[PDB]
Paper text:
We aimed to develop covalent inhibitors targeting tyrosine residues in the protein kinases JAK3 and MK2 using structure-based design principles to generate small sets of ligands containing tyrosine-reactive sulfonyl fluoride and the less-explored fluorosulfate warheads. By utilizing a structure-based approach with well-characterized kinases, we focus on Janus kinase 3 (JAK3) and mitogen-activated protein kinase-activated protein kinase 2 (MK2, also known as MAPKAPK2) as model targets. In conclusion, we successfully synthesized a small but diverse set of novel fluorosulfate and sulfonyl fluoride warhead-bearing compounds, initially designed to covalently target tyrosine residues in both JAK3 and MK2 using structure-based design principles.
MK2, a serine/threonine kinase activated by the p38 MAP kinase, plays a critical role in the cellular stress response, inflammation, and regulation of pro-inflammatory cytokines. While compound 43 (bearing a fluorosulfate next to the piperazine) showed no binding in our experiments, 64 (the sulfonyl fluoride analogue) showed 15% covalent modification of the protein and compound 42 (bearing a fluorosulfate next to the chloride) displayed an impressive 95% covalent binding to MK2 within the time frame of the experiment. To determine the exact location of the covalent modification, we solved an X-ray crystal structure with the most efficient covalent binder, compound 42, in complex with MK2. To our surprise, 42 does not bind into the allosteric pocket at all but rather occupies the ATP binding site where it reacts with the “catalytic” lysine, Lys93. The reason for the poor activity seen in enzymatic assays despite an orthosteric binding mode may reside in the relatively slow inactivation kinetics of fluorosulfates which may not compensate for a relatively weak non-covalent affinity on the assay time scale and under ATP-competitive conditions. Consistent with this, the measured kinact/KI value of 1.12 M−1 s−1 (see also the ESI†) confirms the low overall efficiency of covalent binding process, supporting the hypothesis that the weak non-covalent affinity and slow inactivation kinetics limit the compound's activity. Beyond the covalent interaction, the hinge binding mode of this compound is also intriguing: since the inhibitor was not designed to be orthosteric, it does not contain an obvious hinge binding motif. Instead, the carbonyl oxygen of the amide bond interacts with the backbone amine of Leu141, similar to the hinge interaction observed for skepinone-type inhibitors of the upstream kinase p38α,66 yet without the peptide flip induced by the latter. In our second tyrosine targeting study, unexpectedly, one of the putative allosteric MK2 inhibitors formed a covalent bond with the “catalytic” lysine, showcasing an unanticipated binding mode not just in its covalent interaction but also in the atypical interaction of the carbonyl group with the hinge region.
Author numbering: 47 to 69, 76 to 215, 239 to 264, 273 to 364
């Protein structure tokens, strides 16, 4: 129940890690004692930088959040820097994995399982009254390239402590990610297909025809316009579909085929989500 506080080391990082002065693109480095590989984490020391690291430190323990190993305050070309050491995440981004399946065969069940992984992260946070506020594709990365790897949430660069409705956009993000997992495109309104005509019903049939109302209902609750009426993390993780993924139909989703078809738009998807987030926060 009692966890230790953040200790930012002051001593030069290269006493501890092989870096080789090739040193915010993220770098692979090596612990000298253990010779293990890690990632790093280079920020501009600033009040804000510190609050995020703090918040991230309070969450590192969560199995579905990228762990901080060590933090250094060092001078890089006489710029005060936070160097943040974290475990390597070589698995890539959640949706890239899905898109690159050779057979292109993703199931409702797999979607359920993923969403539980992500839910867990958000539950850890929300219950210690932190809000992530930047839950999107680029921030969901896998440990290893392997089939049985683990999902970790990243970028605490919009986190903050939440004495309520700040948590709401974490849930709106859940809504969006869930929806994309289920069909391959976001629930947002040349050369390619239009997936959701403007103003039309939120679950188009080509890809949503075999998804149950139960699951459409869960999604409508996460995307609820009014935060006063949007699903909470407690409600989410208590929902049957999340709670019991093993009983979730292995419904063949269109997701992997669509992400491949609409690959040119992915930058655009991510940008529309990022824009949207800045108005929702
Ligand atoms: S920050 O707090 O923003 O969180 C964060 C963490 C990572 C992160 C942790 C571990 C890794 C990692 O090891 N790799 C692999 C790698 C490969 C080559 C050189 C260095 N590292 C990794 C994974 C993913 C990414 N990015 C690239 C930019 N788009 C998103 C994925 C870089 C490095 O990374 C990464 C990013 C963030 Cl924000």
């Amino acid at each position: 129940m009692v966890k230790s506080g953040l200790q930012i080391k002051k001593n030069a990082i290269i006493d501890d890690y092989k870096v080789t002065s090739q040193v915010g693109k993220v770098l692979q480095i090596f612990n000298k004692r253990t010779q293990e590989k890690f990632a790093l984490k280079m920020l501009q020391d600033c009040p804000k930088a510190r609050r995020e690291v703090e918040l991230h430190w309070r969450a590192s323990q969560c199995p579905h959040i990228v762990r901080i190993v060590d933090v250094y305050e060092n001078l890089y070309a006489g710029r005060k820097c936070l160097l943040i050491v974290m475990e390597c995440l070589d698995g890539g981004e959640l949706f890239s994995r899905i898109q690159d399946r050779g057979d292109q065969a993703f199931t409702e069940r797999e979607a359920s399982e993923i969403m539980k992984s992500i839910g867990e992260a958000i539950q850890y946070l929300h219950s210690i009254n932190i809000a992530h506020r930047d839950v999107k594709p680029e921030n969901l990365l896998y440990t290893s390239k392997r089939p049985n790897a683990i999902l970790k949430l990243t970028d605490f660069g919009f986190a903050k402590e939440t004495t309520k409705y700040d948590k709401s956009c974490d849930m709106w993000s859940l809504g969006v990610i869930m929806y994309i997992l289920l069909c391959g495109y976001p629930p947002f309104y040349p050369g390619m297909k239009t997936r959701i005509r403007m103003g039309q019903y939120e679950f188009p049939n080509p890809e949503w025809s075999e998804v149950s109302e139960e699951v459409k209902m869960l999604i409508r609750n996460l995307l609820k316009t009014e935060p006063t009426q949007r699903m909470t993390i407690t409600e989410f993780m208590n929902h049957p579909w999340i709670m019991q993924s093993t009983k979730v139909p292995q419904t063949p989703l269109h997701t992997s085929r669509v992400l491949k078809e609409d690959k040119e738009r992915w930058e655009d998807v991510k940008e529309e989500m990022t824009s949207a987030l800045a108005t929702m926060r």
